[PDB]
Paper text:
Noroviruses, which are classified in the family Caliciviridae, are the leading causative agents of nonbacterial acute gastroenteritis in humans. The norovirus capsid is composed of 180 molecules of the VP1 major capsid protein which is encoded by open reading frame 2 (ORF2) in the positive-sense, single-stranded RNA genome. Normally, 90 dimers of VP1 proteins self-assemble to form a T = 3 icosahedral particle of 38 nm in diameter. The P domain is further divided into two subdomains, P1 and P2.
Residue numbers in the entry:
A (entry chain D), B (entry chain F): 2 to 161
C (entry chain C): 1 to 170
D (entry chain E): 1 to 168
E (entry chain A): 274 to 408, 412 to 533
F (entry chain B): 274 to 532
G (entry chain G): 413 to 439, 445 to 533
Write the structure that this text describes.
Amino acid sequence: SALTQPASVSGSPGQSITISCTGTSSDVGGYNYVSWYQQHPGKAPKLMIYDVSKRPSGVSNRFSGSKSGNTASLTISGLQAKDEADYYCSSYTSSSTWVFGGGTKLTVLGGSDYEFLKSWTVEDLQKRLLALDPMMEQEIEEIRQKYQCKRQPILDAIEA
Amino acid sequence: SALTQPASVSGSPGQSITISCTGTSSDVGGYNYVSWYQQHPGKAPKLMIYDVSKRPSGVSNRFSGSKSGNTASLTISGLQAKDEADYYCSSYTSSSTWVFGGGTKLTVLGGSDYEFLKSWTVEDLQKRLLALDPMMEQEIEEIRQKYQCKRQPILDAIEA
Amino acid sequence: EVQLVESGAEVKKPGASVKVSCKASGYTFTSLYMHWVRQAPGQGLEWMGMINPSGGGTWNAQKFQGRVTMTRDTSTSTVYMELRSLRSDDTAMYYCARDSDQYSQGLGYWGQGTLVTVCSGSDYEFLKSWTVEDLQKRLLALDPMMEQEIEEIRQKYQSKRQPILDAIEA
Amino acid sequence: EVQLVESGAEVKKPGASVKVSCKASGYTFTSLYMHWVRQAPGQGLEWMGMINPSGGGTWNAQKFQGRVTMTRDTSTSTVYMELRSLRSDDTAMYYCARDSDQYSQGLGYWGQGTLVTVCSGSDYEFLKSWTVEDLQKRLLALDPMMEQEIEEIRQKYQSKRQPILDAI
Amino acid sequence: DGQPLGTTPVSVSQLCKFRGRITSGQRVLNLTELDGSPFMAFAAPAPAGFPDLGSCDWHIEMSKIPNSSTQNNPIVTNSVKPNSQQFVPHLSSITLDENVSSGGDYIGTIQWTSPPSDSGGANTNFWKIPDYGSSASQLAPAVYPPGFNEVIVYFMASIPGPNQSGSPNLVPCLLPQEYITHFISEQAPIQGEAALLHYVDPDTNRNLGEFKLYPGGYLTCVPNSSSTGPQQLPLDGVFVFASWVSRFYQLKPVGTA
Amino acid sequence: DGQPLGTTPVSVSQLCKFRGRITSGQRVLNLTELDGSPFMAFAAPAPAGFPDLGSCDWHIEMSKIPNSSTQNNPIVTNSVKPNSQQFVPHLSSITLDENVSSGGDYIGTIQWTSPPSDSGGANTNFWKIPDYGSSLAEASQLAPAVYPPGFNEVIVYFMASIPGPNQSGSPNLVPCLLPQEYITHFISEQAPIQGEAALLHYVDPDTNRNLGEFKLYPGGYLTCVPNSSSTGPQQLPLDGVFVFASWVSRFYQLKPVGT
Amino acid sequence: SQLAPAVYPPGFNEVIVYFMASIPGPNNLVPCLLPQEYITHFISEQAPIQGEAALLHYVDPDTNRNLGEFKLYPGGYLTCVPNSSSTGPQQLPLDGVFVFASWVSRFYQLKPVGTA
């Protein structure tokens, strides 16, 4: 089985927002070990709610999680720009394994007239340049990695 | 205090040499832990002999240390150039402290005639090219620092 | 401070065993667990296995059973993943992660990741006939492709210009 | 693979306190005791004490008793050496070294070495009164002199190359 | 009557402990007795007090039994996999997972247990015993639950270690070690088929439940229902001997519901 | 006659173990009893089975008692400095050297002992005890010290090895007045006392030769008369059984033991 | 395997004596536990064993004196207590004759054998 998450979730900056995670009785209701993973598309994920309703150090109190019966929910209050990422819930399984969800693309609108992003702190605009950089370079090595095997087969075919 | 050691002992290649470390009963005789050392002039010292006669992995079987009453001795057999380094003895004192020896010197007198240089094996020669640079790097450590010593109080003087 | 360093990206032929490593330093190797996480490009994370550094303890996902073999060496403080029967699906972001703490049970300390890409083929069939054929003029297409990457960054440069454009007049 | 690296070479005015670190990685920090060894230029190795990574536990030599103060950080797996009232003889090659094995009880794994330097001058507060105007110029003029002193030992390096050329 | 069976130690000190010589740089531990004595293979399946925590991975901690060390931390962490064919305590040799730097006589216990490896992801089942590498067998006879709706009563203690279900890592037991020590010290003869023990609260002198003690050395009872049993009994009670009874003595069921 | 004094536990299981609850990211350990019940200061200087290895640096291996975790190694290694002022078990609080990330009920023992820190570089003197919390004000205080009786009599101690280095490189032996099996037997069977001392005989069970005679005082310690400056009872074999010969007066003169 | 049982010297000292015999070859002295003639004598006379052990004298047929004494066990081996680590039954002459006195137990501890 595979954990199920909403394909995309929307929310304007400023107010609260809830992310849902639903699984089977054994996967999410059987045990109290569900971990919420937020990953910017560039770099590796990082801990948000590693145990339901419990928060690791170094993480803002805005991100909070809860589980009601057979559904685990992330609730985020004071949503703003730098939460734009794909969020995953991971839970223990009856098969002594850890399962992962599809992921929710947190769609937060901002800078429609391009005035909102400059209305934030001056660091955020510099952060936005630092925010785009990780996933802006992944495509390069993505072409590079296939490029490492678009041509070796044809010289192998030459030797064939 | 410090273990009394010979200032310098030398032997020709081929004939085994023996270097002895001397100390009181509280230093060497009382306890069975004596460590024999060797320091390349540029490289960090490593371990030849520990626990009187036990040898760590990574050093040739020729090195062998022993304890005779209040005197500990190190035996080296069939010397070559690569053994040219200062040997340090250390014993666990009765004061719950480790005390180092004075530091003996051994130099292989072979090669002074300049005909024994070719007598060394190609591997023996090859390490000699890569050995005369690092200990000269040790010298320039002193050259960059005797003048850092006398540069220091004009940088204060310019400030003051 | 603890760092997880992977071996590095490497492109493997289909059906060829792929060997990956994850350096561990700055913490006791045997106490914490090492996990392996794969993220398909733009598809989401998935968990394949987890290893006992203190001897054996290989437990992997049910769908990966018989495919992934994991081992560790305490002398070098590294963990090795081995995979078999490489197909077009295994090209993804391979991640090594450990729990935040002995009692944490949360993977938050990940590595840099390796972009192990499987050769999808789809060109052996067309370019095996007629032996060399015109591939001589096709194998020299290495240099022209470099200009495309210069064009891609221009597209990347296009979208990393507006925030400063909004910043200057802010 | 396990190695020890430290802060690096430092220059200190005598009478102050020097702070030396020693980064440890690749092994269980609390499992092995950490020793501190100093070597003055042209003098034998000296042992200024040991530090237990597990909760303090400092034992230092009597001649350095009351002078060194050693502490460890379990989070960063780093051991700190702190020596106050540096003297002319105190400049030395500062080594941090753990044991080769838990039961070996011999310093086999040593650090890269750190070089704390002391000068103590001869009379410099006198030099501040009138020599400060040309003191920097005297320094800058003397800078190339030792640059060819490295070349002087380069000449020695080339001098000892000739016998090895005949050996080849 | 105070006759120990299998690798049962007299006192708690020698429980889950092992002592042996291992050459430097190797991983095989040549088991000896806990007091630095040669181990007789024929007498016992394993050295006295050797662990029987089967179907799980042992993560041992060891130290040289004569303290010849003055500087460093003496504990060395290693792991033993009982399911491995090299784990043969009967032949006085078990192979640790990792290499040991320095040779000598190491004494050690089981620090923690993990789910067994090379077993298809099986959980840390503490109700099974290791293979012991026996080749006739001198193991303790297997105790079977008697009929008449009687079930063996086990005593649980926690050993640190993870499990596949996140449940407490409770190991079963047949008789508290104090009872074993008392029986060995006081070799009282057996005068009946079984001994009826009353579980009496010391303060109120109330028999909360009654149990049958068999001469084989295991305590049994009768559960009131599948959902109840001795687990509901308070831990502060003390077993008080009542009488010798036949095997057919039908106990009053313990528990509620 | 069988009333344990100080922090003597009934059985070996809770002998050197300690249990407590710690907040996350803190080094203060709020002690409780081994079974988990709250500890009372007026009951004893420390929770039953608390270690009393004084003049040494403890190195504990705690673990979460309920075993909630499912993956990682639960053993957490920390150290305790009994010479530190914060070491006040009588107040049900001891501070570890390193902060513990995960909070919860922790149970652990002493793994190894090192020479005490911040104590002038003294050796591991296992014959001393840690300075417990302030107990003069409270009713429960330390058990009275057992002074050696006169008549050339020396208290006999039973020695067991604990891991950990010592400054002399000698075996790390922890002395104890009586074996724990004897204490359990005395507690279970509370026989009264009919004389000022008990004349024990150390006899080899099979050959039945009287290796030496010992006096067992009601305070709970064994005394003997060493034959000479030699170590005395240490030469005796360990495969011996103490048999209660008779009740004797205090002034009973033991036959010298050893050679 | 119905193998014969290993013999443990019981109690303090009471080492088990061996009858060395030389076989030519590499340079050899193989040990022994009981003479074959003694085995034949025991087989011929099927008499019961009393007590725990049988005490034997190593009497010399010349002087009829007991140079050494030995304790014989029903397990089929001989025991004795040496004077010291080196001095023991080896110092006894090879010309002596073994006899039987009575049946003794572990209570009877033999006086040390050997000239030191």
